[PDB]
Every structure is written in C-alpha cells, then in structure tokens.
C-alpha cells in the first residue's frame, strides 16, 4: 500500500484536508499533527487525482506520496 504526507498546513487545514480526502477514499493509519497530516491509502484512486483535488486548497509541493 501507499502513504500520503501533507506539510506546512495552516490552521484548520489538517481537519479540512482529512475531510476532503474522506470524500475521495477511505484512509487508514491517520496521523494528525499540529501542521501535518499523514495516512495510508487503499489504492482505489489515482494519486494525481488526489493531488488535483487537494490543490484546490494547498500547493503541490506540500504533498508527498511514498511506499509504506
């Protein structure tokens, strides 16, 4: 499976982006930090699709995908 990491989030974005990700897939192993958010992705959505939706709110350099 794959892991997504979101950094340099401003106030309210950690909750907001968990919710946005919620609409697109089911997240496991969620870790909500003060200004960061990481979670494991099922693999039922292309990552480019996640990035495009998440980019409605943040920048592309704040999103990282990696093999767990």
């Amino acid at each position: 499976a794959r892991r997504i990491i979101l950094s340099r989030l401003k106030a309210g974005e950690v909750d907001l982006l968990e919710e946005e990700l919620g609409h697109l897939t089911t997240l496991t192993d969620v870790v909500k930090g003060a200004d960061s958010l990481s979670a494991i992705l099922p693999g039922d959505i292309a990552e480019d699709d996640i990035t495009a939706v998440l980019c409605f709110v943040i920048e592309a350099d704040q999103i990282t995908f990696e093999t767990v």
Partner: protein, 128 residues
C-alpha cells in the same frame, strides 16, 4: 481583489442566480451579470472583460463541466477563475472538476462566509 471585478453567475434557476448575486453584493461585489446555461454563458463571455465565473453544474443544453472545459481550452480566457457549484460532494464530480481545471468547487446551499473563503482562496492562488 478589485471590488468592481466583473462576475458571470451561471445557473438555470433564476432564484439560485438571484441568491448568488445578493451573496456577492453582501461581499461588496456589484458588477455581476447572469446566464442560464453553458451556451448562454459562452455567448456573454464573448463581450469580454469578465474577471470571475461562478457556475452551476447541472444545466440543460450545456452543463457546467462542459462550460469549464470550454473556458479552459479558449486562449483568450483560459485562465479565467471558475468556481463550480454542486449540490453534493461526490468523488467522481470533485475529481472531474479538479482535473478539468476548476479554480474550486462549493456545495449548495452555501453561506456568504463559505463563499468568501472560496473567493479568497482563489484570489490568493491567482495573485488577485
């Protein structure tokens, strides 16, 4: 953002159009024009001088996703901010909107405060 930014509000229900116009008025934006579907929006956009498009999703003749794709493939207005209005957050539609170049999307019914946050986020991203 320039308070006299010209808006094109698109929706097949005149009531929804009046609602959006009043909400924009509540935010200080009074230079607003209306359209009833995607075709009618492309026709008015021809007059030029538009700064923002707020568009409904489901409309007859030409829907919002097709209007968006058309604005984005047109060299003269390809960078025009387009905010998509939908009645439900649903994966297939959000992805479609993002991948087609939507500046953002908002779920109706929405408040003036939600509209302000949406507009401000787009203004920040585009440097307006």
């Amino acid at each position: 953002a320039d308070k006299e930014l010209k808006f094109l509000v698109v929706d097949d229900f005149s009531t929804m159009r009046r609602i959006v116009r009043n909400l924009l008025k509540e935010l200080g934006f009074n230079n607003v024009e209306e359209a009833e579907d995607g075709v009618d929006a492309l026709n008015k956009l021809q007059a030029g001088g538009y700064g923002f498009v707020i568009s409904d999703w489901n409309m007859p003749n030409m829907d919002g996703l097709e209007l968006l794709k058309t604005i984005r493939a047109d060299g003269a207005m390809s960078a025009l901010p387009v905010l998509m209005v939908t009645a439900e957050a649903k994966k297939e539609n959000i992805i479609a909107a993002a991948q087609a170049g939507a500046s953002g999307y908002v779920v109706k019914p929405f408040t003036a405060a939600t509209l302000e946050e949406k507009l401000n986020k787009i203004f920040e991203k585009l440097g307006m």
